[PDB]
Amino acid sequence: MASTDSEKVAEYLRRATLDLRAARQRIRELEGEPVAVVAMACRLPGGVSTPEEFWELLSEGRDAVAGLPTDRGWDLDSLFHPDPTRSGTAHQRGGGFLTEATAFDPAFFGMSPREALAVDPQQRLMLELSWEVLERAGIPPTSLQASPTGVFVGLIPQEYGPRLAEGGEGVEGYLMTGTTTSVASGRIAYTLGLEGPAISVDTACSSSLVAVHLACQSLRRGESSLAMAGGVTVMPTPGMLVDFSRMNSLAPDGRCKAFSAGANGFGMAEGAGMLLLERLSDARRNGHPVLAVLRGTAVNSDGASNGLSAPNGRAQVRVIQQALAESGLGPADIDAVEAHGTGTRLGDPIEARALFEAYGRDREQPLHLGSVKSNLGHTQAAAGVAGVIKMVLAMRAGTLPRTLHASERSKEIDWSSGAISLLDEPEPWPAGARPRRAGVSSFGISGTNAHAIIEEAPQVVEGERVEAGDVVAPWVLSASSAEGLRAQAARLAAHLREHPGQDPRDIAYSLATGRAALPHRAAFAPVDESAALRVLDGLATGNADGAAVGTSRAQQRAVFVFPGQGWQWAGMAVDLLDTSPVFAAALRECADALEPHLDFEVIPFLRAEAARREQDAALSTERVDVVQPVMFAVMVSLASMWRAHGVEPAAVIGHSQGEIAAACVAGALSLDDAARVVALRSRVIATMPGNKGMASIAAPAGEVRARIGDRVEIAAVNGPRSVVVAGDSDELDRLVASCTTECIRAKRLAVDYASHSSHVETIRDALHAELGEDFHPLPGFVPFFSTVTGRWTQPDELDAGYWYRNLRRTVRFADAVRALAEQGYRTFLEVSAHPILTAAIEEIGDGSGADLSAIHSLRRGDGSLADFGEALSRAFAAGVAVDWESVHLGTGARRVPLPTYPFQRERVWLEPLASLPAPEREKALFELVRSHAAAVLGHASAERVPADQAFAELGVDSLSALELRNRLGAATGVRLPTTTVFDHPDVRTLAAHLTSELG
């Protein structure tokens, strides 16, 4: 039996123990789960616009207090009067103020220029910080759609434009949507599609830190897997400079003399900070970069203090101690407190006593006391987060910063203990045995005192491997404007010329996985850091040298077209096989599928030249029975590579023998099945090697339809000026002889068989005999457009009869791709060794609908991995949504800090009928609709508003949409439907519909 009462109750014990070991790590991850700070964003006083720019303002001791802003239209004259009690005057003669908060990029988001004018400068600087903190983390900001991601923004209600009661001249419906902190967290979750809790925090000088507390909580509860915490205090008005002066609290110099005897007020500054918070387990499991770790944050109130504004000591001690208790740490653990340091000779005394009580009472080493407001100024709701960026930069650089204007230690504070040393000099603060911890404090004017604990990120990042690879991963970048496209290559060139030695695959991985796909794409496959910074120096000016550039809005899914004959060179795929493992494996698989039916192994054939066969008295790839299997093999291998690099087909087009590849890659037939088909076919297609042959020519279809005769009739329609005719030697030579003198050239391809005619049925006996019923038709994986019927048909229609029928009637390749554009798909990849008929589909798109994008894999005499990298580059630049977690699935690539989006900022500040003549009418209504659009869009420059951009990405929300439809219902005098903005998403579509509604 079971060894009574010794192998069960000991077996039940290990589970009442291990479940307990699992039900306690749940409490410890529900309450003391150390959350990581994934990325940093900051727009701080001075020139600070990025977290790395804040360090050389903080490490070399630069004060950001310069002067009051002049961009904002401030009075600046009634702000200063000798009488200190005059209503309307401010006491501080400066302060650290943002020089870029006045400007914004409206067209970047789904925001109208008028709406962005109505947007609070806080809410317009917060969206950019959100985009930066997402692009800094290697997380595509457009990849977080309908995902749990909380937004926690600390804010200060600030007066902006005219009274809501008085409305405005253009800002009538959007003025609330700016001057409400409500949408100051919802707008960010709306533009980025974040689904997690969009919460705005308002506790004044502690808001952001209080905010991060909430975000921390939302991580330690699991409500949101990710959070974007922080706070902003951007001042569009001098109002509280006038009002803080009435209580006599502003420093006349505007400088936060934290813990100094020369302090004469708490100063003021405007700024903004944002933290990307994720729990450590999720941060490391997902691979998100962990800068530092918020371990424990506490939020408390001052209680019944000496007024609402005066701080409280016991409450501050209580919140600082509660942060340590909730973080599981003690006073000694914190190596460098960075407390509020308001700047006044009243708040600093009280708060230093609280620091000495919570920390200095039991200290082993002198606590390094600092204050970010000394370098920046009191940023209010941006204070509490700004100190967090300080410390995180301190631990990512291993140095404790200075506290400016702190040489004269305050005489009202007892520093005789020595447990607190004010950071007046840069103290080396290196990584060691002790986990490097510290603590940020923020005590708001509302009385809410809050404290967060920041530990250094556990140094487990070390251990990465090193290697080298021949894969030239594309350096892909994208922006919302052409100028931004030229600015995202200049800033990247600046970063790779000022931060040299960063390995190219790391840069490609960070640019590819970490940057959103925006509708102006530049992509190039670099070979060196000198051939890349040269392309980045030509892309900054607009010259497309060694790169691919494309505007590809509303384009996400690609079509795989399969050309037939045309690359008689066939000296390409040797390099691809020799350099690409996938082409060295898929080719082997399809060859070993071809070998049981056609003994020719494509491997000896591969390693050779284009003139190899010519030396053995044989034309370049002319033997049908030997050639058709090799195009099929190279073709299916190229398609397998394209699907292995993340590009999956949407539709499939097979010109002549691309139907076999449609069978194979789309899942309709297996590798063996489709190989068997082309093998058995090649032998019953090489049985007609007499006078037969085709002659591709740009001769017009409506005239060759009269030229049909002498056995030479159309076999394929590859475009408007592209016709493949097939016949015997009756009209063969005379076609060239009688056409070449009239600027029309007959491209007589070196072929010996005719297809898509009445001659294939001469082998109908053998074609139905030497094909067999074994490649049973199966519903595959990709939709396919038949080139025998010219229609989108089932994936299960595919037998020997289908192969006969395809080689029987006209291909109608032009019709197939016209229906392609019609079904919603706009991009096609010419998988082949050389892209014959590349301009044919550009001709198709030129004379019908919109222009199509001709992506090709490789060219004639171009088969190295550099050319395939250029293929991926031109695919991305032309709108193809490449998967960059597959190109960089493994190459020894790691995330690297890169410059964020270059927001093309423009100053947006709010201060307190045609009788059917011709298609000239089409373009006249077009211009009319555009002008009424860029007058309800607040585009003061009516000049242009992108034609390919939707009515939901130019900020055409209700107000804009409704007034637009009313303007059109008056100018054109029509009855546009109520949901017209949804019926016609584009100004192109709207104009076409309106000019089509003439009767």
Epitope: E7, K8, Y12
Partner: antibody, heavy 118, light 114 residues
Framework: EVQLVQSGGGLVQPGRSLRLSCTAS????????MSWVRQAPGKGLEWVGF??????????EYAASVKGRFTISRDDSKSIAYLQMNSLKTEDTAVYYC?????????WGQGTLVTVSS | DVVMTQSPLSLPVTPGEPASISCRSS???????????LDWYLQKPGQSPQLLIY???NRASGVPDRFSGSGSGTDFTLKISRVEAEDVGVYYC??????????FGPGTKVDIKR
């Protein structure tokens, strides 16, 4: 985490030998008692056998039907448990399960479909 | 002898409903320890079984709270406070008094109720 990854499928005829290997990852293998449970098609579980923990003697206990033939062994150094199936009769056509306890079958592993047909 | 057990083999459940599956044992599974020695197990349709409850009432780690166990020495009851698609399958009543364990019993065939 913990996994009880299995292997040992294939083709056997009445009167042959087979091996069922269970690899445990996540905890110490020596103090858990391995068990093999079988899934007859159409019904739930039936327990095949169980070996004691290494320090609990490591003695075995199977069902009377599979006594002896279905040997149960284990090992910590390479951390592997063997069910050697011997003379699989046609009643051994079943899904076998590696259980993580003599009386407390915790993880159940994945499940190997062993077929015994002529 | 052996503690041969019975259960409601064909107990139906419907979404949004609390269900009460039971087991009845011939002998007393309450050991001198004072702890009931019964185990509740769940087999998913075409998947590996899982250990829901041990010692009569307590959870296994990773098993949702929606299962609760109780009962006396002979009668045992598991209530599912809220049934879902993951709470469908076969429920096994396992005695830990005598182990040889020849079979797992008939098992409770749980189905979504219409």
């Amino acid at each position: 985490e913990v996994q009880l990854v299995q292997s040992g499928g294939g083709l056997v005829q009445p009167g042959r030998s087979l091996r069922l290997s269970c690899t445990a990852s996540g905890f110490t293998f020596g103090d858990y008692a391995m068990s093999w449970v079988r899934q007859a098609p159409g019904k739930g579980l039936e327990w095949v056998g169980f070996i004691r923990s290494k320090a609990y003697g490591g003695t075995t206990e199977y069902a009377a039907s599979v006594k002896g033939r279905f040997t149960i062994s284990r090992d910590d150094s390479k951390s592997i448990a063997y069910l050697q199936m011997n003379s699989l009769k046609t009643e051994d056509t079943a899904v076998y399960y590696c259980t993580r306890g003599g009386t407390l079958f915790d993880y159940w592993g994945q499940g190997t479909l062993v077929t015994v047909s002529s | 002898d052996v503690v041969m057990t019975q259960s409601p083999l064909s107990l139906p459940v419907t979404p949004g409903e609390p269900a009460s599956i039971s087991c009845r044992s011939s002998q007393s599974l309450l050991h001198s320890n004072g702890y009931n020695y019964l185990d509740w197990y769940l087999q998913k349709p075409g998947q590996s079984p899982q250990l829901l409850i041990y010692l009569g009432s307590n959870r296994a780690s990773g098993v949702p709270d929606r299962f609760s166990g109780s009962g006396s020495g002979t009668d045992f009851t598991l209530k599912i406070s809220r049934v879902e698609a993951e709470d469908v399958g076969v429920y096994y009543c396992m005695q830990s008094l005598q182990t040889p364990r020849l079979t797992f019993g008939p098992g409770t065939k749980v189905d979504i109720k219409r």
